[PDB]
Amino acid sequence: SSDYARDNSYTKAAEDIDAQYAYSGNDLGVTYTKDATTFKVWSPTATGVKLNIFTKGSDDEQGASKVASYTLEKMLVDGEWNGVWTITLVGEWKDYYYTYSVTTTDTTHIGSDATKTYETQDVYSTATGVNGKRSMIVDLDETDPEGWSNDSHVLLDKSTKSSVWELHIKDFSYDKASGVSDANRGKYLAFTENGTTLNGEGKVSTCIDYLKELGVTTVQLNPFYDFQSVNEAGDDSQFNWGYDPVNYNVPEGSYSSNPYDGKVRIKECKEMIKALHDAGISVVMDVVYNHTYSTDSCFQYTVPNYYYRMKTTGAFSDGSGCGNEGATERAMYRQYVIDSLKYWVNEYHVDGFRFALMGLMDVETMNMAREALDQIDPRITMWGEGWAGGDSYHPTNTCSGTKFYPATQANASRLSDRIAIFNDGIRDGIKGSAMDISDVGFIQGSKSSAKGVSYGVRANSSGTYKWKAQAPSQCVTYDACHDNATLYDQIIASTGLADYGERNSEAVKMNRLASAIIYTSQGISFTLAGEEMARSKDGDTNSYKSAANLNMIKWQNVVDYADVVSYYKGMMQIKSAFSPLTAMDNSYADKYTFTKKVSASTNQISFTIQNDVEGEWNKMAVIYNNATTAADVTLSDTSVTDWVVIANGETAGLDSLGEVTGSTFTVPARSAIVAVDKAGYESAGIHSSKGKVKVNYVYEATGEKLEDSVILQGSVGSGYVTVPSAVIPDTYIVSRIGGNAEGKYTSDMQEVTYYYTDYIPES
Ligand SMILES: OC[C@H]1O[C@H](O[C@H]2[C@H](O)[C@@H](O)[C@@H](O[C@H]3[C@H](O)[C@@H](O)[C@H](O)O[C@@H]3CO)O[C@@H]2CO)[C@H](O)[C@@H](O)[C@@H]1O
Ligand SMILES: [Ca+2]
Ligand code: NA
């Protein structure tokens, strides 16, 4: 909750080590050629460093042998030691594994006889064997897949033009119904599989083909650096999010087809990224420099008590709530983090980063990292959690001698406006407190939550409620992520409308409303992968090590909630057509007219946005109605009185859904209206290229609807599958179908009617 500046023996010692031994060299770890291989280790605390060579990454493998051990020597600049140990092995050392045996004091007993010896993999490992205990010497060119030389970054012109899909690699394709091959389900190489369909029946698209259709700009991948919590030699049914770092610069083994050979995971990890780039998707990497799984790490075994934040009592500061904190303010951890980021960008073609507990990382380091990545390309995205997971004890100043500031929401002003911050303001505003699955926000009917949404609409960059972003560029707009409950699960829990993962019409209405808010709000639009298909975790509010089949994306939901997918798909189009919504800066802040005060307690939020981009819509009107009844909303902005509706309770997109004359709109219960000026709609010529299918549910005898009709919307020639309504009482059964239950989208709207008759459920 709090951070404390406390200077002590540990911090002063570490600061002295930086002053004398800070090494800006580029070459720590292994420098490989066919002719020789050089090893470098930074450890001013050591009295000796020994290199151990092996044939295999573990002793259980066929051919496993200790080759030899060698003595590293102190590296001398003049006649002076720079803190670096080095040796050069002459010959071909490709595909050998190694550890270091480091004999070392701690930071507060340098030059003393109080040493211990630790065996460790390289701090600067670029490859490891199974479970990351032994590093591997590799020619990185050999790990490049076919086409890798032609693979470019996929970068957004502006971060605020993004639509982010937060995905776990196992979740993506562990489901058998994903249509991914037995070999590749839950693995890096699932992303390379094109033409995948539900149950491989060839009717409706899944996985990579689904993402192309959905139109997400960005996939954010949950930890795919090497973590501790999956035994890579164990069973395929294991699951962890992987916020348990062991090797920061090595891919996770369990997502590969072979973790024993250290080259395989690298190649396959690159194939995943290439595949996403080929589909025109940007790749954002979840990174966790804020803590390591344990202090029995390569860092601590190489330079004890340097790389972690130390309290005066000798205890490790526990700001992460996982046991330790990485000391970003230290010269050589700062350098490690920035070099690591550059490595993932250059070597793996990563396009941006999501920083776990960014509130533990110091502002100066984050700003230097932003600067470093700008040298590559400023379009490289950065965002993080502007909070910590416990009390943080740090030195007063950084290694540069500037005051320490944590990169929290409170210090947004001190942070680059292109290091964005998760907006828990709009998160809690939309669906209720993330700390309480049963708590209600705006979509469930909270009037007091309205202000959270209203401040969220301008990315908490206009006025101050809870926290203030510098600009929309500094704000991630979201209602749910991997943490806590899924949107749909919180809707279900807070209302009691149904069981977890069961379709309910009112629940789905609330889900559509949340969609409307996210994509008519400024900042970087962000969803949990499958939010658009009503993803459930069966009520699990912390699924980090829960069952694999619980966590996995249920691909059947692309059919069961096809209409909801279609709604998101359409809302995404609206945001990307109307420039004020994807603004990086504050230039549109004074162009909003809210009908009520932003801080108002209300069932209906409405606002207009004046645009200034030629060839776009001139003005947009947006209305959220969380009431259980229809509401007539009259805009305070009466400058436009001819409107074209482009999203309602039924559908969203770029096509006209009907017109409104005047300043008053009828908004159905628990739904949104998005309208644009008539003149602008005509002149801009913005229109949908997507086909539509309308699904009706009719009592055959009378012709009355048993349930509201729904709208599917997708690319022309792409496959769709409709189903009978899941919510219709069990005393009705489908007697016949009119139209094509399944087929392909056309330019013309197609209709399917499920005709119902009287039924009594049997034994
Ligand atoms: O044994 C290791 C620790 O395991 C447990 O911590 C879990 C969390 O319960 C889990 O929610 C997840 O937290 C991370 C969160 O999902 C992510 O968004 C954020 O950026 O970082 C969080 C970690 O700081 O993962 C951790 C670690 O696996 C347990 O609660 C903890 O006490 C144990 O030390
Ligand atoms: Ca691992
Ligand atoms: Na598999």
Side-chain angles (χ1 to χ4, degrees), residues 1-61 63-77 79-761 763:
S1 32
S2 297
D3 70 291
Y4 304 101
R6 301 290 186 281
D7 301 308
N8 54 46
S9 58
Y10 297 102
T11 60
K12 294 163 193 155
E15 282 169 4
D16 276 331
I17 287 159
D18 288 347
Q20 194 183 336
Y21 291 112
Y23 182 72
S24 71
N26 201 20
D27 51 5
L28 292 181
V30 160
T31 304
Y32 166 84
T33 71
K34 298 235 218 312
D35 299 334
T37 302
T38 305
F39 305 77
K40 291 207 166 77
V41 175
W42 186 76
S43 174
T45 54
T47 58
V49 180
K50 170 172 69 76
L51 172 61
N52 314 301
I53 308 296
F54 310 80
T55 61
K56 301 295 161 187
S58 69
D59 293 332
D60 288 349
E61 302 180 51
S65 294
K66 303 186 96 275
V67 172
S69 300
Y70 303 91
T71 312
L72 273 65
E73 305 294 347
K74 282 182 172 181
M75 194 177 155
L76 312 150
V77 161
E80 179 188 298
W81 182 40
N82 64 354
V84 176
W85 300 84
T86 188
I87 196 178
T88 304
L89 295 184
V90 198
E92 179 66 286
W93 290 92
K94 226 192 323 194
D95 305 329
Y96 281 90
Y97 300 81
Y98 70 97
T99 58
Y100 302 116
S101 307
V102 177
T103 309
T104 179
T105 70
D106 66 6
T107 54
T108 54
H109 298 86
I110 287 194
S112 124
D113 71 335
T115 78
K116 342 94 222 175
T117 309
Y118 305 103
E119 211 193 332
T120 179
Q121 81 279 23
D122 205 322
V123 167
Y124 285 84
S125 298
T126 63
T128 68
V130 59
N131 286 324
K133 304 226 87 80
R134 294 187 184 151
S135 309
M136 185 184 179
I137 307 158
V138 302
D139 187 355
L140 279 174
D141 292 351
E142 291 184 355
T143 68
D144 291 354
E146 175 175 348
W148 189 247
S149 67
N150 290 323
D151 187 75
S152 304
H153 290 285
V154 172
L155 299 171
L156 276 294
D157 191 69
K158 313 182 192 179
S159 57
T160 43
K161 284 177 181 170
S162 305
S163 51
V164 184
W165 214 63
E166 185 194 35
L167 177 66
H168 188 278
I169 287 164
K170 193 167 191 81
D171 285 350
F172 186 57
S173 65
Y174 186 66
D175 187 5
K176 221 294 190 195
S178 72
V180 171
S181 69
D182 295 336
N184 290 333
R185 280 201 294 282
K187 304 284 194 180
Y188 290 126
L189 294 180
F191 289 85
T192 74
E193 295 209 6
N194 296 313
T196 61
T197 63
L198 186 63
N199 301 120
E201 286 175 310
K203 290 169 178 167
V204 61
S205 286
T206 58
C207 297
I208 199 68
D209 276 0
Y210 167 90
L211 290 181
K212 292 182 212 177
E213 178 58 23
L214 182 53
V216 298
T217 71
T218 307
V219 166
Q220 179 180 304
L221 290 171
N222 290 114
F224 69 88
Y225 61 83
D226 188 36
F227 51 83
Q228 184 268 354
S229 43
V230 167
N231 182 12
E232 296 173 5
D235 190 281
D236 179 57
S237 61
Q238 294 176 70
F239 179 95
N240 203 287
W241 285 339
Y243 291 104
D244 307 310
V246 184
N247 299 288
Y248 280 124
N249 290 347
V250 175
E252 166 61 15
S254 70
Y255 301 138
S256 83
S257 72
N258 182 354
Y260 299 97
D261 176 354
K263 281 208 265 39
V264 171
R265 69 177 78 175
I266 299 166
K267 166 102 83 173
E268 293 183 355
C269 180
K270 287 181 186 172
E271 284 186 69
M272 168 179 73
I273 292 171
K274 177 178 152 49
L276 280 164
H277 283 164
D278 286 349
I281 299 165
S282 185
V283 174
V284 174
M285 185 176 182
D286 198 333
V287 294
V288 191
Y289 299 113
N290 72 75
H291 82 281
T292 64
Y293 171 65
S294 77
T295 52
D296 291 331
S297 62
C298 52
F299 292 99
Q300 184 70 4
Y301 286 172
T302 304
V303 193
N305 296 348
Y306 174 87
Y307 285 107
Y308 301 97
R309 298 209 176 101
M310 308 298 305
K311 296 168 76 157
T312 309
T313 52
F316 294 99
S317 189
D318 194 14
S320 66
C322 294
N324 64 259
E325 296 172 47
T328 56
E329 72 277 13
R330 295 271 58 84
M332 291 304 296
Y333 194 57
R334 175 175 289 175
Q335 183 180 294
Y336 186 89
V337 167
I338 294 171
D339 287 356
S340 180
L341 293 173
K342 296 195 313 196
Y343 177 72
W344 283 105
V345 169
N346 294 321
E347 187 59 30
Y348 287 89
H349 301 168
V350 168
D351 306 297
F353 297 101
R354 175 264 193 197
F355 291 88
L357 299 182
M358 197 169 61
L360 286 180
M361 308 181 70
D362 77 276
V363 161
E364 190 178 47
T365 295
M366 293 309 307
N367 286 345
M368 285 170 171
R370 178 69 273 179
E371 173 58 29
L373 295 176
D374 283 347
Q375 305 316 289
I376 306 175
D377 197 303
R379 294 176 292 175
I380 292 163
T381 53
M382 289 174 69
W383 54 74
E385 292 169 306
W387 58 67
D391 285 1
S392 179
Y393 291 79
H394 60 261
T396 294
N397 300 319
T398 71
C399 57
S400 311
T402 54
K403 189 151 163 284
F404 184 110
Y405 288 95
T408 57
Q409 284 182 333
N411 292 323
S413 57
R414 314 190 98 96
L415 202 65
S416 165
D417 62 341
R418 281 183 301 101
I419 307 165
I421 300 167
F422 280 99
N423 186 9
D424 49 353
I426 203 181
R427 185 200 63 194
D428 289 359
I430 285 163
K431 77 162 189 324
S433 179
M435 298 310 107
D436 185 354
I437 200 180
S438 73
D439 189 51
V440 292
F442 183 76
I443 65 186
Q444 301 103 316
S446 176
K447 284 142 55 60
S448 54
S449 299
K451 64 177 72 69
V453 173
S454 292
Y455 274 89
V457 159
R458 281 180 294 188
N460 277 57
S461 64
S462 189
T464 300
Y465 175 66
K466 297 183 166 179
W467 77 287
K468 192 181 184 292
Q470 275 199 60
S473 65
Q474 210 180 41
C475 179
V476 186
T477 296
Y478 79 131
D479 57 47
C481 65
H482 73 274
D483 276 312
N484 312 300
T486 75
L487 175 58
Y488 196 66
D489 276 358
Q490 178 123 7
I491 289 167
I492 285 297
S494 57
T495 66
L497 277 165
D499 292 331
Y500 293 119
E502 172 175 25
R503 178 149 180 150
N504 172 278
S505 285
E506 289 303 312
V508 163
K509 283 184 177 178
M510 294 176 180
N511 202 328
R512 289 184 188 110
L513 180 52
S515 188
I517 295 168
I518 292 294
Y519 286 110
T520 56
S521 292
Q522 286 185 314
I524 305 167
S525 289
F526 181 102
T527 64
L528 179 64
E531 177 187 320
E532 74 284 357
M533 64 173 93
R535 180 166 175 186
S536 178
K537 292 176 176 177
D538 210 32
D540 195 327
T541 53
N542 191 29
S543 70
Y544 76 104
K545 60 163 161 74
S546 297
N549 58 1
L550 175 146
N551 269 294
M552 69 184 183
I553 288 168
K554 173 186 178 167
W555 283 104
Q556 175 60 39
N557 280 18
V558 305
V559 171
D560 291 1
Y561 300 87
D563 57 316
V564 183
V565 174
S566 297
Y567 199 89
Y568 277 75
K569 191 189 298 191
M571 280 306 317
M572 291 155 78
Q573 285 182 285
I574 291 183
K575 175 148 182 179
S576 73
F578 189 67
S579 279
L581 293 174
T582 62
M584 290 281 280
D585 67 15
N586 297 308
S587 62
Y588 291 96
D590 63 2
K591 303 312 189 311
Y592 285 66
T593 318
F594 281 73
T595 303
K596 303 188 175 201
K597 312 285 266 287
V598 173
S599 65
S601 178
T602 183
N603 288 114
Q604 293 88 33
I605 301 163
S606 60
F607 56 96
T608 68
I609 314 172
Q610 179 67 53
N611 195 9
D612 60 5
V613 175
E614 176 166 4
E616 287 188 9
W617 305 316
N618 296 299
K619 174 157 281 174
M620 182 178 282
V622 181
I623 314 167
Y624 315 136
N625 178 31
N626 79 356
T628 56
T629 54
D632 277 33
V633 178
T634 306
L635 302 171
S636 64
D637 178 9
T638 63
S639 66
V640 171
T641 57
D642 302 295
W643 299 98
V644 172
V645 180
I646 61 166
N648 55 25
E650 178 178 291
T651 184
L654 301 175
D655 282 345
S656 172
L657 305 179
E659 301 191 11
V660 173
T661 308
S663 296
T664 295
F665 299 75
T666 295
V667 193
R670 292 177 172 157
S671 76
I673 289 290
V674 181
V676 301
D677 70 295
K678 171 43 133 39
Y681 188 83
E682 303 290 40
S683 58
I686 301 165
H687 66 316
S688 182
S689 56
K690 303 292 165 165
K692 280 178 177 176
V693 172
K694 184 169 154 159
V695 186
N696 314 294
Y697 320 97
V698 171
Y699 189 66
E700 191 172 1
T702 62
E704 307 270 284
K705 292 183 173 184
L706 289 162
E707 175 70 27
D708 289 342
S709 298
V710 302
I711 290 290
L712 275 59
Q713 181 196 148
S715 297
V716 174
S718 74
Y720 71 84
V721 175
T722 70
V723 285
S725 176
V727 298
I728 286 177
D730 62 7
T731 49
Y732 306 103
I733 198 170
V734 172
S735 54
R736 73 182 183 88
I737 309 176
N740 290 119
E742 17 189 291
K744 294 187 148 197
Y745 287 104
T746 62
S747 336
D748 288 346
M749 193 183 74
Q750 301 168 267
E751 291 214 34
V752 191
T753 297
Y754 290 92
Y755 293 95
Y756 285 83
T757 192
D758 297 318
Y759 183 67
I760 294 287
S763 171

